Amino acid sequence: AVDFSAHPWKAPGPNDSRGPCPGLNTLANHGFLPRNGRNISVPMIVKAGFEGYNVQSDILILAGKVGMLTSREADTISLEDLKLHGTIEHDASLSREDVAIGDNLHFNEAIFTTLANSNPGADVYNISSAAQVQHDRLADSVARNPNVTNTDLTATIRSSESAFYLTVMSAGDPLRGEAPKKFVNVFFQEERMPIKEGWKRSTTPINLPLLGPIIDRITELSDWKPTGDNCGAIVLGPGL
Amino acid sequence: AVDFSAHPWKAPGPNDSRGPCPGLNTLANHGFLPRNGRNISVPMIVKAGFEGYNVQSDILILAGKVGMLTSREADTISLEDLKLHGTIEHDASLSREDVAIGDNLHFNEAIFTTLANSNPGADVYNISSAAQVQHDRLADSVARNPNVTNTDLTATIRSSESAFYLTVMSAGDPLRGEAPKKFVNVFFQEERMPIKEGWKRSTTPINLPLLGPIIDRITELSDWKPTGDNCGAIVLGPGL
Numbered sequence: 315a316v317d318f319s320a321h322p323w324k325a326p327g328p329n330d331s332r333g334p335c336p337g338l339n340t341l342a343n344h345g346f347l348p349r350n351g352r353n354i355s356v357p358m359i360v361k362a363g364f365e366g367y368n369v370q371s372d373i374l375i376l377a378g379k380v381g382m383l384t385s386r387e388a389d390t391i392s393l394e395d396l397k398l399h400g401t402i403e404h405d406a407s408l409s410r411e412d413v414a415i416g417d418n419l420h421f422n423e424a425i426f427t428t429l430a431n432s433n434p435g436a437d438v439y440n441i442s443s444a445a446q447v448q449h450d451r452l453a454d455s456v457a458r459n460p461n462v463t464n465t466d467l468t469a470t471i472r473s474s475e476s477a478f479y480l481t482v483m484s485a486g487d488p489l490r491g492e493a494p495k496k497f498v499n500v501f502f503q504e505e506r507m508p509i510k511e512g513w514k515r516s517t518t519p520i521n522l523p524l525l526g527p528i529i530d531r532i533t534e535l536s537d538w539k540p541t542g543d544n545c546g547a548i549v550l551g552p553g554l
Numbered sequence: 555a556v557d558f559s560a561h562p563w564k565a566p567g568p569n570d571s572r573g574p575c576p577g578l579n580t581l582a583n584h585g586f587l588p589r590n591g592r593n594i595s596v597p598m599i600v601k602a603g604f605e606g607y608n609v610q611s612d613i614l615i616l617a618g619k620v621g622m623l624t625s626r627e628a629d630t631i632s633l634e635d636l637k638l639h640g641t642i643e644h645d646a647s648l649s650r651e652d653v654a655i656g657d658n659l660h661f662n663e664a665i666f667t668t669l670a671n672s673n674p675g676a677d678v679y680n681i682s683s684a685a686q687v688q689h690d691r692l693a694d695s696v697a698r699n700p701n702v703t704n705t706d707l708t709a710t711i712r713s714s715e716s717a718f719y720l721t722v723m724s725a726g727d728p729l730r731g732e733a734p735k736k737f738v739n740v741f742f743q744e745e746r747m748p749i750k751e752g753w754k755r756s757t758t759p760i761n762l763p764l765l766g767p768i769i770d771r772i773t774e775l776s777d778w779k780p781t782g783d784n785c786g787a788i789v790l791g792p793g794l
């Protein structure tokens with residue numbers, strides 16, 4: 315049985331590995347993944363994402379094995395390894411800076427302002443607000459980053475990530491594609507499960523069939539267009 | 555200290571998974587990897603390649619983790635999974651057909667004829683013969699396959715594979731970049747270590763520093779040019 319009371323939030327120490335992903339960082343901060351953020355396998359991620367968020371193995375195996383490429387080890391990563399630019403890590407993040415013009419690893423409040431201020435007049439973020447934020451964040455990178463990369467692949471990953479915050483931090487059925495701002499804000503700003511605030515793990519499995527139409531709708535509403543190269547080539551390992 | 559008498563060749567049975575790679579197939583056929591070809595992890599590949607061939611973890615971790623993408627499992631593959639087109643598997647193979655116009659999985663004697671007939675008048679294959687074979691195999695694909703994919707990435711993989719047969723099946727120092735035809739022919743045709751024929755595991759470690767200049771020289775001598783977009787994008791998982 316999973317006992318959330320047995321999984322308290324603790325702030326990471328200075329030598330606990332944390333990465334650019336709030337999903338995995340939050341799992342580590344609650345001990346669903348190792349609190350040190352090290353020696354993490356795809357099986358560990360699969361189990362952690364299921365226990366913490368009811369996210370299913372389909373998306374976690376797919377994403378997990380791509381993430382494994384970022385380390386030099388046979389079958390594990392440190393969470394910090396995931397910052398490797400151009401494997402999964404991309405420009406026009408929701409809460410991090412572009413690597414060419416800043417820190418692509420740590421939560422940045424100034425970047426996060428765009429998301430925080432989205433969906434004015436409501437107490438939830440939803441698909442249309444998520445799309446607007448993606449549009450605005452990409453425009454910011456195009457304006458300010460002379461090395462900006464924007465491809466079909468980065469755009470899809472970005473929509474996947476928005477679909478994650480909308481589903482995993484939902485109050486009701488994750489199908490609805492909306493999440494309380496108070497929950498999503500805690501998730502990004504503190505990398506904590508907002509238990510005190512009333513959040514509970516989804517009782518509905520979050521899998522590719524559920525996420526797919528949400529992802530596609532976020533993309534559609536974001537008014538995304540190709541801007542240049544558009545080759546969806548990933549970096550296959552570190553130090554190439 | 556490896557005892558190859560403890561690792562006899564046995565023909566694969568009808569339920570044994572085999573893939574497009576003679577290196578891994580041969581390891582399975584000698585029980586360095588599971589003879590059934592199933593539930594193979596990157597650690598297993600690292601250990602197997604070391605024990606069988608003296609191939610080091612640098613190349614096997616890098617290649618292994620890319621290979622893991624081809625399955626639906628968290629941290630293992632079946633050898634047959636590696637046939638997934640556009641992850642590692644490519645057009646203009648040495649011993650398989652292009653997927654668009656034939657069987658990209660099984661050894662094909664007619665394809666192998668080009669390699670078998672290379673370096674006429676010597677009893678070895680070497681860097682210049684390997685380069686000629688790559689040139690000729692690519693020309694064949696460009697002639698006969700309207701869907702040919704030929705990129706910096708596929709060209710590098712192809713030269714890596716040639717460097718592998720030249721080094722792993724060598725008689726003396728793998729550094730020399732030459733291997734007896736009688737050894738290489740058995741390797742491809744029977745997916746067997748040619749022990750009876752006089753082959754022994756290299757006493758020199760085969761790693762990226764050793765392979766790199768061989769790879770680069772094969773490419774240089776092959777009179778290579780890209781096709782089309784030259785997009786080095788890999789397929790990130792099955793059933794996309």
Ligand code: HEM
Nearest residue numbers: 334335337369377381396402403404407408409410475478
């Ligand atoms: C399934 C539960 C997970 C959730 C809820 C989740 C959530 C998120 C969110 C919301 C972001 C966007 C952060 C931003 O734009 O500032 C993100 C980024 C990221 N995630 Fe995850 N994630 C999960 C699993 C994974 C897995 C399994 C990996 C393994 C590769 C991963 C790797 C990353 C990376 C590398 C980024 C940085 C992308 C970027 O913004 O540049 N995530 N994740």
Ligand code: HEM
Nearest residue numbers: 574575577603618621636642643644647648649650715718
């Ligand atoms: C252990 C030492 C290795 C050797 C000596 C070796 C040798 C070879 C050779 C010679 C080929 C070319 C076959 C051809 O063109 O017909 C090949 C193809 C291939 N190898 Fe390996 N290999 C090794 C390790 C690996 C590993 C670790 C992976 C992935 C886990 C891998 C995946 C492949 C794939 C997918 C192909 C097919 C590429 C193609 O021809 O389309 N190999 N290998």
Ligand SMILES: *[C@@H]1O[C@H](CO)[C@@H](O)[C@H](O)[C@H]1NC(C)=O
Nearest residue numbers: 350352353354355387389390
């Ligand atoms: C990582 O985890 C594996 C599996 O539990 C263990 O055998 C190994 O000793 C660990 N390595 C480190 C760095 O602690």
Ligand SMILES: *[C@@H]1O[C@H](CO)[C@@H](O)[C@H](O)[C@H]1NC(C)=O
Nearest residue numbers: 433434435436440441442443
């Ligand atoms: C998101 O919320 C806003 C404000 O409540 C609303 O106007 C908009 O239609 C919503 N979008 C979706 C897709 O539910």
Ligand SMILES: *[C@@H]1O[C@H](CO)[C@@H](O)[C@H](O)[C@H]1NC(C)=O
Nearest residue numbers: 399413414415459460461462
């Ligand atoms: C980034 O862009 C600048 C300005 O065009 C250029 O000088 C530099 O070489 C680029 N760097 C990369 C990472 O390609």
Ligand SMILES: *[C@@H]1O[C@H](CO)[C@@H](O)[C@H](O)[C@H]1NC(C)=O
Nearest residue numbers: 592593627628629630631632
């Ligand atoms: C082993 O491989 C089979 C398919 O051949 C798969 O169903 C099974 O889950 C695998 N198990 C693991 C996790 O190694």
Ligand SMILES: *[C@@H]1O[C@H](CO)[C@@H](O)[C@H](O)[C@H]1NC(C)=O
Nearest residue numbers: 652653654655699700701702
């Ligand atoms: C090959 O290319 C043609 C033309 O671009 C395309 O219609 C077809 O679907 C492709 N695939 C195969 C394997 O024939």
Ligand SMILES: *[C@@H]1O[C@H](CO)[C@@H](O)[C@H](O)[C@H]1NC(C)=O
Nearest residue numbers: 673675676679680681682683
């Ligand atoms: C390969 O062998 C042939 C025939 O012996 C020889 O002409 C050629 O120079 C050799 N090339 C290399 C790279 O040693």
Ligand SMILES: CCCCCCCCCCCCCC
Nearest residue numbers: 376377380470471474790794
């Ligand atoms: C954090 C999300 C990572 C997801 C990686 C792969 C999913 C994206 C779309 C599917 C693969 C890309 C080719 C269509």
Ligand SMILES: CCCCCCCCCCCCCC
Nearest residue numbers: 550616617620642710711714
């Ligand atoms: C199976 C052999 C190679 C497949 C993956 C190679 C990874 C990308 C190549 C870049 C560096 C390796 C050789 C120079």
Ligand SMILES: [Mg+2]
Nearest residue numbers: 403404405407
């Ligand atoms: Mg980023």
Ligand SMILES: [Mg+2]
Nearest residue numbers: 643644645647
């Ligand atoms: Mg092939």
